[PDB]
Design an enzyme around this catalytic site. Structure first.
Site, PDB file in Angstrom:
ATOM      1  N   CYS A 184      -0.149   2.569  -4.302  1.00 37.38           N
ATOM      2  CA  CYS A 184      -0.953   3.769  -4.493  1.00 37.38           C
ATOM      3  C   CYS A 184      -0.117   4.973  -4.070  1.00 37.38           C
ATOM      4  O   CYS A 184       0.798   4.846  -3.255  1.00 37.38           O
ATOM      5  CB  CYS A 184      -2.249   3.706  -3.683  1.00 37.38           C
TER       6      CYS A 184
ATOM      7  N   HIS B 172       0.866  -1.165   0.000  1.00 38.02           N
ATOM      8  CA  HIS B 172       0.000   0.000   0.000  1.00 38.02           C
ATOM      9  C   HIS B 172       0.909   1.223   0.000  1.00 38.02           C
ATOM     10  O   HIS B 172       2.081   1.138   0.377  1.00 38.02           O
ATOM     11  CB  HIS B 172      -0.910   0.010   1.233  1.00 38.02           C
TER      12      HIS B 172
HETATM   13  C1  LIG Z   1      -3.194   1.105  -3.041  1.00 37.14           C
HETATM   14  O1  LIG Z   1      -2.579   1.290  -2.002  1.00 37.14           O
HETATM   15  C2  LIG Z   1      -3.323  -0.296  -3.588  1.00 37.14           C
HETATM   16  C3  LIG Z   1      -2.046  -0.662  -4.343  1.00 37.14           C
HETATM   17  C4  LIG Z   1      -1.773  -2.147  -4.260  1.00 37.14           C
HETATM   18  O2  LIG Z   1      -0.973  -2.644  -5.081  1.00 37.14           O
HETATM   19  O3  LIG Z   1      -2.345  -2.829  -3.381  1.00 37.14           O
HETATM   20  N1  LIG Z   1      -4.474  -0.453  -4.457  1.00 37.14           N
HETATM   21  C5  LIG Z   1      -5.705  -0.727  -4.018  1.00 37.14           C
HETATM   22  O4  LIG Z   1      -5.966  -0.989  -2.852  1.00 37.14           O
HETATM   23  C6  LIG Z   1      -6.781  -0.681  -5.070  1.00 37.14           C
HETATM   24  C7  LIG Z   1      -7.931   0.227  -4.634  1.00 37.14           C
HETATM   25  C8  LIG Z   1      -7.757   1.606  -5.224  1.00 37.14           C
HETATM   26  C9  LIG Z   1      -7.253  -2.098  -5.430  1.00 37.14           C
HETATM   27  C10 LIG Z   1      -8.381  -2.648  -4.559  1.00 37.14           C
HETATM   28  C11 LIG Z   1      -8.813  -4.036  -5.024  1.00 37.14           C
HETATM   29  C12 LIG Z   1     -10.064  -3.986  -5.895  1.00 37.14           C
HETATM   30  N2  LIG Z   1      -9.823  -4.485  -7.239  1.00 37.14           N
HETATM   31  C13 LIG Z   1     -10.600  -4.174  -8.281  1.00 37.14           C
HETATM   32  O5  LIG Z   1     -11.581  -3.453  -8.160  1.00 37.14           O
HETATM   33  C14 LIG Z   1     -10.269  -4.739  -9.639  1.00 37.14           C
HETATM   34  C15 LIG Z   1     -11.293  -5.023 -10.543  1.00 37.14           C
HETATM   35  C16 LIG Z   1     -10.997  -5.552 -11.800  1.00 37.14           C
HETATM   36  C17 LIG Z   1      -9.677  -5.821 -12.166  1.00 37.14           C
HETATM   37  N3  LIG Z   1      -9.462  -6.348 -13.408  1.00 37.14           N
HETATM   38  C18 LIG Z   1      -8.284  -6.722 -13.991  1.00 37.14           C
HETATM   39  C19 LIG Z   1      -8.265  -6.941 -15.369  1.00 37.14           C
HETATM   40  N4  LIG Z   1      -7.135  -7.331 -15.979  1.00 37.14           N
HETATM   41  C20 LIG Z   1      -6.018  -7.540 -15.267  1.00 37.14           C
HETATM   42  C21 LIG Z   1      -4.847  -7.958 -15.901  1.00 37.14           C
HETATM   43  C22 LIG Z   1      -3.687  -8.174 -15.157  1.00 37.14           C
HETATM   44  C23 LIG Z   1      -3.700  -7.973 -13.775  1.00 37.14           C
HETATM   45  C24 LIG Z   1      -4.872  -7.555 -13.144  1.00 37.14           C
HETATM   46  C25 LIG Z   1      -6.030  -7.334 -13.890  1.00 37.14           C
HETATM   47  N5  LIG Z   1      -7.161  -6.938 -13.283  1.00 37.14           N
HETATM   48  C26 LIG Z   1      -8.652  -5.542 -11.255  1.00 37.14           C
HETATM   49  C27 LIG Z   1      -8.947  -5.006 -10.000  1.00 37.14           C
END
Ligand SMILES: *C(=O)[C@H](CC(=O)O)NC(=O)[C@H](CC)CCCCNC(=O)c1ccc(Nc2cnc3ccccc3n2)cc1
Ligand SMILES: *C(=O)[C@H](CC(=O)O)NC(=O)[C@H](CC)CCCCNC(=O)c1ccc(Nc2cnc3ccccc3n2)cc1
Lengths: 88, 173, 88, 173
Positions: free
Chosen positions: B161, B113
């Site tokens: 992030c 994070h």
């Molecule tokens: C921030 O501190 C962190 C950074 C980290 O690396 O952890 N990010 C987060 O916490 C974010 C919120 C802003 C992520 C939260 C998790 C929720 N994920 C999603 O909503 C989500 C939805 C769809 C996809 N699709 C997708 C499609 N193709 C690919 C290809 C390769 C890899 C991933 C991927 N994902 C992803 C995430």
């Protein structure tokens, strides 16, 4: 005999997004920046220097979807092209 | 074939390697002989945190990056769930490794994070921040604190992030 | 119809030195970074993209003298090569 | 001959321009037609300060950069001896210029004293800082605050100190 050298040189940093902004991650597929970087390194390490590769990674993010991010290259003091020459 | 040491990384042929070395004069970083070099890489990944959401999927990133860097000829150290202080201690130890002397380059990978100010340690909360700044990473690996990596490419990759904003603006065509 | 665009994209910053460090300037000859940049732009704008040119500027500072500095490229979100095409 | 509009800048021939456009596919920034484009550049240079040493030789830099950017096809605005607030006001005005709509790129040049935190305004002192941060420059020129420069290269050049250190370490051969 002593000689002077630059305190900071030959660095490159590559971040997953721009300042102030989120970077995305999938619970089973992993981080998009990491996955994209691996793919581009696998494909282009043979023919492109690392700075060129990072630009290509950026370009792949050019068209924004529902989860937009723009990887940023930071604090670059590479004086030469860094070719990985995979296999050598 | 991906059964070789370089796995899925496309190989640079001898003809291609000679062409790149000929196209550009003295503007390429020198590569050490494969038989003798001791390339090092470090991955620090935080998945499980005390006060912030779990980074589910981080294991996929660890696997991918570890294998990729190995494919590229680097010996990969993987450290998990560290505080900012622990990251500093690990980075300082990495900078002191004797292998860098017989190496031509290094890769550092941080995955956690993050906020605007930097990368989150495992103990991070809004009340008591646990942050490693990018500035600190550079300082720990520069010529003063890591003389062994003088003149050698140091590639830093950060998945994190950098704030809470979506990174987008609207426009009409 | 509205569409999403990256808030920060297509930027390149080029600084005269690395963080914490001085940049040099002559009372009659001007700043060394500025003079060096002009020379390299005059020479290489025709054949190299701006990122390539900035790297060449850096390389010219590689060997430290009595007044060492290392120009740094910062916060790069160029997704493509920026060629100036002088004369066009 | 340097008597032309491009002065001492070496010209890119039609053959060279066609070769670069052929070697790389869709990985080059599009250039607008010479007959219609309205390229803009801005130079902010601080030479004379209230409380810090005079930047003797700055005029050489102004001349060189102004002529260079003109050579490259940019209309150059030159502003001298501004506070950080005045720089902000000038940058905001630059971002609002109608010419950017019919332009393909821009150059921003800052030349002043500087500290670790940023660029010094004319009124800067240790007691009462007068600093413009690089972060502010980016924000003022991004897609939110400057939609006219969307998808267009924005090159920022900064001549300034970033601290008091000499930038060197010793080593023995
Ligand atoms: C921030 O501190 C962190 C950074 C980290 O690396 O952890 N990010 C987060 O916490 C974010 C919120 C802003 C992520 C939260 C998790 C929720 N994920 C999603 O909503 C989500 C939805 C769809 C996809 N699709 C997708 C499609 N193709 C690919 C290809 C390769 C890899 C991933 C991927 N994902 C992803 C995430
Ligand atoms: C920091 O805030 C400022 C940045 C600025 O652009 O003003 N920098 C300074 O104040 C530094 C002090 C760290 C400059 C002080 C002025 C003193 N100058 C010199 O000592 C000096 C001596 C010799 C040279 N030589 C030289 C040789 N070749 C060239 C070629 C091209 C241009 C200049 C040049 N100069 C320069 C400066």
């Amino acid at each position: 005999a002593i000689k002077k050298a630059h305190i900071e040189k030959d660095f490159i940093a590559f971040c997953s997004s721009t300042p102030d902004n989120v970077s995305w991650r999938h619970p089973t597929m992993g981080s998009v920046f990491i996955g994209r970087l691996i793919e581009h390194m696998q494909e282009y390490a043979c023919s492109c220097d690392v700075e060129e590769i990072f630009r290509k990674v950026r370009f792949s993010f050019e068209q924004p979807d529902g989860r937009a991010q723009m990887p940023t290259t930071e604090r670059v003091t590479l004086t030469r092209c860094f070719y990985l020459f995979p296999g050598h | 074939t991906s059964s070789g040491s370089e796995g899925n990384v496309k190989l640079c042929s001898l003809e291609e390697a000679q062409r790149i070395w000929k196209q550009k004069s003295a503007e390429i970083y020198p590569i050490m002989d494969k038989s003798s070099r001791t390339r090092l890489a470090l991955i620090i990944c935080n998945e499980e945190f005390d006060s912030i959401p779990r980074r589910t999927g981080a294991e996929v990133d660890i696997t991918g990056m570890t294998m990729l860097l190995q494919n590229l000829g680097y010996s990969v150290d993987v450290k998990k769930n560290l505080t900012a202080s622990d990251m500093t201690t690990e980075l300082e130890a990495f900078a002191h490794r004797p292998e860098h002397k017989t190496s031509d380059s290094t890769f550092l990978v941080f995955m956690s994070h993050g906020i605007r100010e930097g990368i989150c340690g495992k103990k991070h909360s809004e009340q008591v921040p646990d942050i490693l700044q990018l500035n600190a990473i550079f300082n720990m690996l520069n010529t003063k604190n890591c003389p062994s990596l003088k003149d050698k490419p140091k590639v830093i990759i950060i998945q994190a992030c950098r704030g809470d904003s979506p990174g987008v603006v609207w426009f009409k065509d």
